[PDB]
Write an enzyme that holds these catalytic residues in place. Structure first.
Site, mmCIF file in Angstrom:
data_model
loop_
_atom_site.group_PDB
_atom_site.id
_atom_site.type_symbol
_atom_site.label_atom_id
_atom_site.label_comp_id
_atom_site.label_asym_id
_atom_site.label_seq_id
_atom_site.Cartn_x
_atom_site.Cartn_y
_atom_site.Cartn_z
ATOM 1 N N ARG A 226 0.791 -1.223 0.000
ATOM 2 C CA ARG A 226 0.000 0.000 0.000
ATOM 3 C C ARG A 226 0.827 1.279 0.000
ATOM 4 N NH1 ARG A 226 -4.314 -2.943 1.976
ATOM 5 N NH2 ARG A 226 -3.278 -3.427 3.958
ATOM 6 N N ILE B 215 -9.535 -7.867 -2.225
ATOM 7 C CA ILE B 215 -10.391 -8.934 -1.718
ATOM 8 C C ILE B 215 -11.698 -9.012 -2.499
ATOM 9 C CG2 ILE B 215 -11.364 -7.448 0.078
ATOM 10 C CD1 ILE B 215 -10.794 -11.287 0.028
ATOM 11 N N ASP C 131 -16.494 -8.331 11.616
ATOM 12 C CA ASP C 131 -15.275 -7.825 10.984
ATOM 13 C C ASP C 131 -15.377 -6.314 10.758
ATOM 14 O OD1 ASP C 131 -13.815 -6.587 9.019
ATOM 15 O OD2 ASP C 131 -13.421 -8.396 7.862
HETATM 16 O O1 LIG Z 1 -8.543 -9.386 10.171
HETATM 17 C C1 LIG Z 1 -7.523 -9.155 9.495
HETATM 18 O O2 LIG Z 1 -6.353 -9.399 9.836
HETATM 19 C C2 LIG Z 1 -7.721 -8.522 8.159
HETATM 20 C C3 LIG Z 1 -6.617 -8.132 7.375
HETATM 21 C C4 LIG Z 1 -6.820 -7.533 6.140
HETATM 22 C C5 LIG Z 1 -5.592 -7.143 5.347
HETATM 23 O O3 LIG Z 1 -4.504 -7.498 5.830
HETATM 24 O O4 LIG Z 1 -5.686 -6.499 4.291
HETATM 25 C C6 LIG Z 1 -8.168 -7.340 5.709
HETATM 26 C C7 LIG Z 1 -9.213 -7.770 6.576
HETATM 27 N N1 LIG Z 1 -8.972 -8.351 7.763
HETATM 28 C C8 LIG Z 1 -10.625 -7.585 6.169
HETATM 29 O O5 LIG Z 1 -11.573 -7.955 6.846
HETATM 30 C C9 LIG Z 1 -10.931 -6.881 4.842
HETATM 31 O O6 LIG Z 1 -12.092 -6.685 4.550
HETATM 32 C C10 LIG Z 1 -9.796 -6.508 4.024
HETATM 33 C C11 LIG Z 1 -9.705 -5.908 2.762
HETATM 34 C C12 LIG Z 1 -8.378 -5.773 2.433
HETATM 35 C C13 LIG Z 1 -7.818 -5.210 1.224
HETATM 36 O O7 LIG Z 1 -6.606 -5.166 1.136
HETATM 37 O O8 LIG Z 1 -8.597 -4.827 0.373
HETATM 38 N N2 LIG Z 1 -7.625 -6.282 3.471
HETATM 39 C C14 LIG Z 1 -8.489 -6.731 4.446
HETATM 40 CA CA LIG Z 2 -11.005 -8.520 8.856
#
Ligand SMILES: O=C(O)c1cc(C(=O)O)c2c(n1)C(=O)C(=O)c1cc(C(=O)O)[nH]c1-2
Ligand SMILES: [Ca+2]
Ligand SMILES: COC1=C(OC)C(=O)C(C/C=C(\C)CC/C=C(\C)CC/C=C(\C)CC/C=C(\C)CC/C=C(\C)CC/C=C(\C)CC/C=C(\C)CC/C=C(\C)CC/C=C(\C)CCC=C(C)C)=C(C)C1=O
Ligand code: HEC
Ligand code: HEC
Ligand code: HEC
Ligand code: HEC
EC number: 1.1.5.5
Lengths: 108, 723, 433
Positions: free
Chosen positions: B113, B554, B308
């Protein structure tokens, strides 16, 4: 205020009467009261652990919506719902969790 | 040099007008640039200045830094490129060679990022968990450290990946990690910016036995956070969650470090902590001392989080007339759908109101700020399915939000993707190399069959799936205006002094709008969707606006068939920059994506159900729900592996494609379950091959709008009181 | 009109694969300097930029035509047969004019000096080169042959024998190092395989099923030429950069015509290098090899990607059972592709960019020789000869991985993505090991 406006006042009838709350609802109320304080970590925790085990509030595979209804400020009594997120003084939130502990004392 | 940090602080007061030295261009993370060379009456004449094609085929979410004419941009697989910010010529490049066997330990793509700059060096984190410093000029390695301690508890499952942008405060590089979706213990580590030595560490959740970790969070964890974590649950084995992967703010005005703490692990509140306790420093904002790492204050936005709802979203600092008096405040727009204004110094809650539709709370408590949960929203306690809005992706995500002091407005890219929450049957069961959320993976996901229940569910989901940009007014706590979009998962926002806001859309368009009324002013087709926030800077005295384009994240990985409602798009990752007198053009590219191929006609029906189940718990996170890919990763329906048992096992069980991200799954699945997955995939391919071929049969060669479920006619912006 | 002419000339130049062999590795386009091995010595590609001193800036249209069709420079000497002027003599006048316009205007002039060939003086004389053209290169009518009734087959034949020069690699060379057949009328020797060029062997393009395109369909040829990845083959070696630099830029009509002409060629006798698989090799590999050195090496290093039956994965890992490249008589290209791997970008029908690792460092010469013999005599394969460790050690010194750089220039497809490291505890051997 008249600053960035605060959240609107909650709606509901506050109360500290715990006549017919029934188990797993007092357990939820004490889950709400152990967090956010207003009772303790030492005299509220024995009620929560022992009211949720004797009457199977969580059970790890079972429902008991009465636990969620009480994890929030709600609790039923004599066919009437009372809200604990009312009582904006926060000193009536206390002595209501204490009242819940007193009501749970004969239950355990 | 110039004592970097002094320059970043002055960037908030008009200093260094043509540089992007931090993640949010400043320590306040306002992402506002005082350059007015490009304004409302002029931005319509913008032209593409240059472009640079990246050597990755996944999502690009990085925020490039610009230091006195050199652009340092981090790409997928944690690669870094230093280019000429004026002409886009590669000055140098560096790749840390992230091992391919950990790619499945990250929740959501192998993204990077951003980076940080300090004293002639550029610092960035690698996906495998390494912090690397390079010379800003030559590009040679200065030092490299492993951010994950071999000792300490961290839970039994330790799925740690680094994808966020590090921030540097007083010569200390602060970095977190992610992986609570799989199970991990969240923490933030500060290393020395000169030698790489570990300065301090702060754990966001208590260790399982309430024992000292030797870190700077020991006192607050053993005295305050531990009693809020049940008595015995899955948090002792999984780790508890609370990873800090997006937001890491330094405030020199208050001299504090703000950490946005993520969700719990597992999501299931009953599984994690018996459905008891607040689970302190989970889904909260924690402010600590930048020097010693000691706790200063905290505010829990989402107690007992089970949807979440991370507080990891962008944290911004402003000055507002609170109670008719100027005050330095923190504004936050986390996943749960509430806009929060709190005091930056003491952490006192000031106000909070939903900026989008949310059905999990009836506002917040005016006296504490704790949400007024509806009893049915706690699906984990009730043990009944819950249709939660916002879903697991939240109303706001890693997409950046901007601020304009000229208009005093906060521009937030918001989305609406509901999710059905239901507990995992038979109790918690943690799987190696799988999402251990603790919820039912059969209930999530949509189907394309003729079942009336499935048809109604898909129709409702398409009805309430939306994307837009809202100009929140913190003084009024009301939206000033909105810009609607076809769908969610758009890029971040950038605000300049020319009253123009820039944003990249999910349909592949880069757009510039008026900052006062939201009128569209400039549009450019970028040949691929934009999920990264745009930046602006100056080179040789002329202003440029640059952005990274690439389809990923995601959302396309998971939602698959419904991930292209904003329009057809594939991944053509690059970096583009526009200037007032640019004379560049994007060369043509192939937009067919992954075309269907006729599958084998033999499959087993008896292995369908469980097979589907297995696909939803191990493969749906990357190859899309119901075996339909979102356009970034290969579609398994047209793959040649499922044509035979041996080839499919050697690809899935043995991980023959580990060098590119396909890791072995024999550590969690028996060969019979893999065969069940193969039969399910073959059945899905046989079901959908004719429909996909018919859809792709047209003039353009890509599926039509009806097949992609793009929304004809504009949809209402959700707001509160209605979805 | 001038822009259209420049674009057409660029298309014809890509059609004739000028850029592939007229650019040195990591060099300016069309600037020459590429090392081309010869039985006499080493030649260097001349720069063909419009530079008036180093390049062909002073070349007129007539000089360009003479150089392309007869191999005569502006000086007047004859170029080496490394220039495919025997094939370029079929170029039509319009194509030559378009290419001349493109090279005089569409190419950036570079000022690199042409490197002299490092050939000893007695063998470096240029006068005998014209005699070679007189003796071995017959006169050819420039343009489409006016004897093939089908326009598509005629266009394909012009492409194969004209701008594209397949016989330069796929046709055996005689005693004078000249192709034994310039067309299908020459006999069965036309496009019937070739000697190893740069340690790569171009197999037969004829109709025999074991080694040629007998089991190839027309759509198979079109897709292989366009992207290099079909369900039963994958491009590598010299073809890899032939596809990357020239063929992937061809129009669909041109590729279809080329495939039609290739499939329409006269029938050729079938070979005996391929047989029927009775499962003996598959049973041996399922047992564990049980004392067969080649089987053990294949199981521990190769069976993970190419399966125990040698069938691989469709459009991901090419099969080794019945594969003509594994079937050809000369195993030089087999050992070359075993020693040096190969990276292929994803396509529309073949996603998930793939990568052969280079086994030149993981395995010894004896192990790779054993695995080559095993794959040549496995799953019904009947390829002749045996490979010793000496040949493997000769190939490991004289040989290098392909550039994989033409996949990433001026292409509508995806980049050739390098593979990530596997990890600290990775092994291709099964869990039982
Ligand atoms: O609970 C976690 O450790 C965790 C990590 C991450 C991440 O590392 O990007 C996301 C999420 N949860 C999550 O719920 C989420 O919707 C999400 C979207 C993204 C992204 O990069 O678009 N990371 C994450
Ligand atoms: Ca999460
Ligand atoms: C007495 O006769 C003799 C002469 O004639 C008087 C000759 O000149 C020559 C010289 C003739 C040759 C070198 C034979 C010509 C053979 C070919 C041109 C075919 C092989 C070359 C290729 C198609 C491969 C070149 C491709 C490259 C290097 C580009 C790819 C790079 C990446 C010989 C040997 C000779 O014997
Ligand atoms: C995210 C980490 C993934 C999960 C979880 C699964 N897969 Fe995957 N897969 C992933 C990538 C990034 C790739 C592409 C590899 C490359 O070379 O680019 C793949 C590829 C496959 C394939 C190959 C398809 C083909 O080449 O046509 C197959 C058959 C496959 N994946 C299967 C598969 C299954 C069955 C999974 C559930 C256990 C699964 N994948 C999970 C990334 C990820
Ligand atoms: C690799 C096999 C080549 C391809 C394909 C093309 N050319 Fe070439 N060319 C090549 C060599 C090795 C040489 C020099 C031989 C020697 O005798 O030194 C040449 C020469 C030319 C020239 C002559 C320039 C001069 O030496 O002053 C020209 C004008 C030329 N080549 C042009 C050209 C064009 C237009 C091509 C596409 C049709 C082309 N060549 C293909 C090697 C190779
Ligand atoms: C020398 C550089 C070559 C020229 C000129 C052409 N081809 Fe080729 N080809 C070459 C090699 C070394 C190989 C080996 C196999 C591989 O995939 O690496 C090939 C192969 C082919 C094939 C596949 C044959 C098989 O798999 O049995 C085809 C269909 C093919 N080549 C076609 C082809 C055409 C049409 C050409 C004229 C444009 C051509 N080749 C030129 C080397 C060389
Ligand atoms: C997975 C990483 C592989 C392993 C292990 C081995 N091979 Fe392979 N091979 C693989 C691919 C993806 C390809 C395609 C070619 C490309 O250019 O990348 C290949 C190719 C071959 C070939 C060439 C045949 C053709 O391309 O049609 C041969 C002869 C071959 N492979 C043999 C081979 C052997 C003997 C191996 C054990 C040492 C082996 N391969 C391992 C993928 C993988």
């Amino acid at each position: 205020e008249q600053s960035p406006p605060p959240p609107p006042a909650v709606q509901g009838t506050p109360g500290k009467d715990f006549t017919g709350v029934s188990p797993a609802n007092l357990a939820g109320i004490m889950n709400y009261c152990v967090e956010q304080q207003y009772v303790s970590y030492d005299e509220g925790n024995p009620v929560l652990y022992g009211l949720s085990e004797k009457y199977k509030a969580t059970e790890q595979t079972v429902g008991n919506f009465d636990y969620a209804l009480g994890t929030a400020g709600y609790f039923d009594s004599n066919g009437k719902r009372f809200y604990l997120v009312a009582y904006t003084n926060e000193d009536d939130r206390r002595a209501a969790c204490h009242a819940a502990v007193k009501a749970a004392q004969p239950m355990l | 040099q110039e004592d970097t940090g002094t320059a970043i602080t002055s960037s908030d007061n008009g200093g260094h007008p043509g540089d992007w030295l931090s993640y949010g261009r400043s320590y306040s993370e306002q992402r506002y640039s005082p350059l007015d060379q490009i304004n409302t009456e002029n931005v319509g004449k913008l032209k593409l200045a240059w472009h640079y094609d990246l050597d990755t085929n996944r999502g690009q979410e990085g925020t490039p830094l610009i230091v006195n004419g050199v652009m340092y941009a981090t790409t997928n697989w944690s690669k870094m490129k230093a280019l000429d910010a004026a002409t886009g010529k590669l000055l140098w490049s560096y790749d840390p060679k992230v091992p391919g066997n950990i790619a499945d330990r990250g929740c959501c793509d192998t993204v990077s990022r951003g980076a940080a700059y300090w004293n002639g060096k550029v610092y960035f984190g690698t996906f495998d968990g390494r912090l690397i410093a390079l010379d800003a000029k030559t590009g040679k390695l200065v030092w490299s450290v492993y951010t994950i301690p071999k000792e300490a508890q961290l839970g039994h499952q330790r799925s740690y990946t680094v994808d966020g942008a590090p921030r540097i405060a007083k010569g200390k590089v602060l970095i977190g990690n992610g992986g609570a979706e799989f199970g991990a213990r969240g923490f933030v580590s500060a290393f020395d910016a000169e030698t790489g030595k570990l300065d301090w560490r702060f754990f966001t959740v208590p260790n399982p036995e309430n024992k000292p970790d030797g870190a700077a969070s020991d006192d607050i964890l053993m005295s305050k956070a531990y009693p809020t974590w049940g008595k015995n649950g899955a948090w002792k084995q999984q780790g508890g969650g609370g990873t800090v992967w997006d937001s890491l703010v330094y405030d020199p005005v208050t001299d504090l470090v703000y950490l946005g703490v993520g969700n719990g692990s597992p999501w299931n509140y009953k599984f994690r902590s018996e459905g008891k306790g607040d689970n302190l420093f989970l889904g909260s904002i924690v402010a600590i001392n930048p020097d010693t790492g000691k706790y200063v204050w905290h505010f829990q936005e989402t107690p007992m989080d089970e949807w979440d709802y991370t507080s990891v979203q962008q944290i911004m600092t402003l000055d507002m007339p609170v109670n008719g008096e100027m005050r330095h405040v923190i504004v936050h727009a986390p996943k749960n759908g509430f806009f929060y204004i709190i005091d930056a110094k003491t952490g006192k809650f000031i106000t909070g109101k939903p900026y989008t539709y949310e059905n999990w709370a009836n506002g917040l408590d005016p006296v504490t700020g704790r949400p007024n949960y509806v009893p049915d929203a706690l699906w984990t306690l009730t043990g009944k399915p819950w249709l939660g809005i916002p879903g697991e992706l939240g109303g706001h995500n890693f997409a950046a939000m901007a601020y304009s002091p000229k208009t005093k407005l906060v521009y937030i890219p918001a989305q609406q993707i509901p999710l059905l929450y239901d507990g995992q049957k038979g109790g918690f069961k943690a799987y190696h190399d799988a999402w251990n959320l603790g919820l039912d993976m059969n209930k999530i996901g949509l189907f394309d069959d003729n079942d009336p229940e499935h048809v109604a569910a898909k129709k409702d989901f398409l009805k309430v799936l939306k994307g837009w940009t809202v100009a929140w007014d913190p003084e009024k706590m009301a939206p000033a205006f909105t810009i609607n979009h076809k769908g969610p998962w758009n890029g971040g926002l950038l605000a300049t002094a020319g009253n123009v806001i820039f944003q990249g859309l999910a349909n592949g368009e880069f757009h510039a709008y008026d900052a006062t009324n939201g009128n569209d002013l400039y549009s450019f087709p970028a040949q691929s969707a934009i999920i990264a926030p745009p930046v602006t800077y100056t080179a040789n005295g002329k202003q440029y606006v640059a952005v990274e384009v690439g389809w990923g994240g995601i959302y396309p990985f998971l939602y698959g068939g419904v991930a292209r409602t904003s329009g057809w798009t594939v991944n053509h990752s690059r970096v583009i920059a526009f200037s007032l007198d640019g004379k560049d053009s994007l060369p043509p590219k192939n937009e067919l994506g992954f075309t269907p191929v006729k599958p084998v006609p033999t499959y087993d029906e008896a292995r369908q159900k469980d097979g589907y189940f297995m696909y939803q718990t191990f493969c749906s996170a990357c190859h899309g729900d119901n075996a339909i890919s979102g356009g970034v990763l290969p579609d398994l329906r047209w793959s040649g592996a499922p044509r035979g048992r041996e080839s499919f096992y050697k690809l899935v069980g043995r991980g023959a494609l580990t060098a590119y991200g396909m890791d072995r799954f024999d550590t969690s699945m028996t060969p019979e379950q893999i065969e069940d997955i193969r039969n399910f995939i073959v059945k899905r391919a046989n079901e959908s091959y004719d429909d996909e071929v018919k859809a792709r049969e047209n003039s353009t060669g890509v599926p039509n709008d009806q097949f992609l479920n793009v929304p004809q006619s504009t949809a209402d912006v959700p707001t509160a009181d209605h979805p | 009109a001038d822009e259209a002419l420049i674009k057409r000339g660029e298309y014809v130049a890509r059609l004739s694969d000028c850029i592939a062999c007229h650019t040195a590795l990591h060099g300016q386009p069309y600037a020459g300097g590429l090392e081309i091995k010869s039985p006499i010595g080493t030649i260097y590609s001349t720069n063909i930029t419009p530079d008036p001193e180093h390049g062909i800036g002073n070349y007129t249209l007539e000089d360009f035509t003479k150089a392309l069709r007869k191999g005569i420079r502006k000086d007047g000497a004859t170029v080496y047969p490394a220039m495919p002027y025997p094939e370029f003599a079929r170029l039509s006048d319009d194509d030559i004019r378009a290419m001349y316009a493109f090279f005089m205007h569409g190419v950036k002039p570079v000022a690199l000096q042409n490197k002299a060939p490092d050939i000893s003086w007695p063998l470096s004389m240029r006068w005998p080169l014209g005699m070679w053209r007189a003796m071995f290169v017959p006169s050819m009518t420039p343009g489409v042959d006016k004897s093939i009734s089908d326009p598509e087959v005629a266009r394909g034949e012009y492409l194969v024998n004209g701008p594209g020069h397949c016989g330069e690699c796929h046709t055996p060379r005689g005693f004078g190092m000249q192709v034994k057949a310039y067309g299908t009328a020459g006999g069965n020797a036309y496009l019937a395989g070739g000697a190893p060029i740069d340690n790569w062997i171009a197999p037969s393009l004829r109709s025999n099923s074991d080694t040629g395109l007998g089991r190839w369909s027309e759509d198979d040829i079109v897709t292989f030429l366009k992207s290099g990845r079909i369900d039963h083959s994958a491009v590598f070696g010299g073809m890899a950069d032939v596809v990357a630099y020239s063929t992937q830029h061809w129009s669909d009509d041109d590729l279809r015509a080329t495939a039609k002409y290739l499939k329409s060629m006269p029938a050729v006798p079938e070979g005996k290098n391929l047989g029927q698989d009775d499962g003996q090799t598959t049973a041996l590999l399922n047992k564990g090899g049980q004392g067969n050195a080649g089987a053990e090496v294949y199981l521990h290093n190769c069976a993970i990607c190419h399966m125990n039956d040698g069938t691989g994965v469709n459009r991901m890992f090419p099969p080794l059972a019945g594969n003509p490249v594994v079937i050809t008589d000369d195993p030089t290209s087999l050992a070359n592709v075993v020693a040096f791997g190969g990276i292929l970008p994803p396509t529309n029908s073949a996603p998930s960019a793939v990568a052969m690792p280079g086994f030149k460092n993981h395995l010894s010469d004896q192990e790779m020789a054993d695995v080559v013999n095993f794959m040549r005599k496995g799953w019904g394969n009947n390829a002749p000869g045996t490979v010793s460790a000496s040949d493997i050690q000769k190939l490991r010194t004289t040989g290098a991985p392909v550039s994989t750089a033409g996949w990433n220039v001026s292409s509508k497809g995806w980049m050739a993505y390098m593979p990530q490291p596997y990890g600290e505890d990775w092994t291709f051997s099964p869990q039982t090991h």
